[PDB]
Amino acid sequence: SAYRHAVERIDSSDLACGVVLHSAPGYPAFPVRLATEIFQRALARLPGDGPVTLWDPCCGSGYLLTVLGLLHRRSLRQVIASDVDPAPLELAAKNLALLSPAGLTARELERREQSERFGKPSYLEAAQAARRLRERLTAEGGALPCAIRTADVFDPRALSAVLAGSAPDVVLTDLPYGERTHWEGQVPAQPVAGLLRSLASALPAHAVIAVTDRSRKIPVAPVKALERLKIGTRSAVLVRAADVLEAGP
Numbered sequence: 001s002a003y004r005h006a007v008e009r010i011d012s013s014d015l016a017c018g019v020v021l022h023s024a025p026g027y028p029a030f031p032v033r034l035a036t037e038i039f040q041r042a043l044a045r046l047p048g049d050g051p052v053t054l055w056d057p058c059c060g061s062g063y064l065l066t067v068l069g070l071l072h073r074r075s076l077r078q079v080i081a082s083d084v085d086p087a088p089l090e091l092a093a094k095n096l097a098l099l100s101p102a103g104l105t106a107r108e109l110e111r112r113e114q115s116e117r118f119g120k121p122s123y124l125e126a127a128q129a130a131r132r133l134r135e136r137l138t139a140e141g142g143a144l145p146c147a148i149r150t151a152d153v154f155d156p157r158a159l160s161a162v163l164a165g166s167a168p169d170v171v172l173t174d175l176p177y178g179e180r181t182h183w184e185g186q187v188p189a190q191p192v193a194g195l196l197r198s199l200a201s202a203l204p205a206h207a208v209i210a211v212t213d214r215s216r217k218i219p220v221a222p223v224k225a226l227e228r229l230k231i232g233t234r235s236a237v238l239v240r241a242a243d244v245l246e247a248g249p
Contacts, residue, residue, distance in 0.1 A: 001229040005040035006033045014129040015067050020107055022094050027061040030174060031234075034212075035067055038229075038236050042170045042208045043075065045226055045238060051077035055168040057153045057199065058176050059083050062092025068172070069099045069144050070133055078145035082162045084152050093148060100143035104134035154194060159202040171199060171209040180214075189219035196223060200244035207241040222247045 012032035017023040043052065052075055056065045059081040069079050079099070081092055097103035108130035115123035137144070147166075151158040175187040192211070199209060208226070211218060216230060218237040227238045 001231050003033070003037055003231075006037040009033055014133055015070065017063060019126050020104070020130045020133060021063055021066055021098065022061070022091060023063075024061055024091050027063070027088060027091065028177075030064040030067065032067060032071075034231055034234060035064055036071055037231070038172060038210050038212065038238075039068055039072060039170070041227065041229075042172065042210045042238060045208045045240070046169060047206055051075060052169045053077050053080070053166055054170050054172065055080040055082070055163075056173050057082050057151070057159075057162070057171065058173045059092050059148070060088045060174065060176065062088075062095035062148075064172070064174060065092075066095040066098055069096075069146070070137060073137055073140035073144055076141075076144055078147075078166070080162065080166060080168060081146065081148040082151045082153075084150065086150055089148060089150065096146050096148055098133075099137075099146055101134050101138055102143075104130050104137065108134070154191075154198055156198040156201045159198065163202060167204045169204070169207055171203065171207060173210075174212045186213050186215035189221075192219060193221075193223065196220070196239060196244045197249075200241035203241040205240075205242040205245075209239045209241065209244075210236060212236045 014020060015032050017029040054076060059065050060083060062081055065079055065081050069076060081096060083089055098107060108127050111123050111127035111130060149162050151162045177183060179187045179191055181188055196209065212234055214233055215235055218235055220237050220239060223239055223244055225237045226240060229236050
C-alpha cells in the first residue's frame with residue numbers, strides 16, 4: 001500500500017492524544033495520517049461531491065471521529081457517533097464537544113490554569129494548540145453539528161433511532177477489540193458480514209463503508225470490496241451499501 005492523499009505528512013501534533021483531544025488508558029489512539037487517508041479515499045468513491053454526513057457506529061472514545069471533524073471540517077455537513085457500551089461514550093462526549101469553538105475555548109482555558117498552577121511548558125503548547133484548532137474550525141465553518149447516542153450495530157432496528165432522520169454518506173469505524181477473537185488477533189468474518197448487512201439496511205444506496213482492523217486482510221466476501229489497503233499493522237476495506245444488499249442473507 002501507499003499514501004495517495006496523506007502523501008506529505010502534515011502538522012498533527014495538535015491532534016495528538018492527550019494534548020487537546022482526550023485520551024484514556026483503555027482506548028487506543030488512531031494514527032492521524034491513516035484516518036485522513038481512509039476518509040479522502042472514501043470521498044473519492046462517492047458519485048458527486050459536497051459536504052458529507054459521516055457516521056461512526058463503533059465510535060469508542062470519539063478520538064477518530066473528532067480528529068476527522070476538525071481536520072476535514074469543510075467536507076463535513078455533520079457527524080454521527082454511536083456505540084453499544086455507555087462506557088466509552090462518556091469520553092466521546094468530551095471529545096465531540098471540541099467540534100465547537102466554545103468547547104475548544106474551555107479546553108484552552110483549562111490548559112492555561114494548569115500552566116499557572118504547575119508551570120510545565122507542555123500545558124502552554126497545549127493551550128496554543130487548542131486556540132489554533134479553534135481558529136481553523138471557525139474559518140472552515142465554525143461549530144460542526146453532531147449527535148451521539150447509544151445503539152447496537154448488530155440490531156438494525158436500533159439503527160433507525162441513531163440516524164434520527166439523517167442519511168449518512170460515509171461510514172467509517174475501527175472495529176472494537178472486544179469483537180476480536182482474542183486481544184491479540186482480529187474480528188472474524190461471521191461478525192463482519194453481519195455488521196455490513198445491518199448497516200447497509202439503514203444507509204442510502206450510494207454510501208461508502210470504511211472498516212479498519214489490526215489484521216493483514218479483512219474477510220468481506222461474498223460481498224465485493226471496492227478497495228483495500230494495508231499500512232503497517234492496519235488494513236482497510238471499503239464497500240458500497242448497494243453492493244452489500246445484493247448478496248443478501
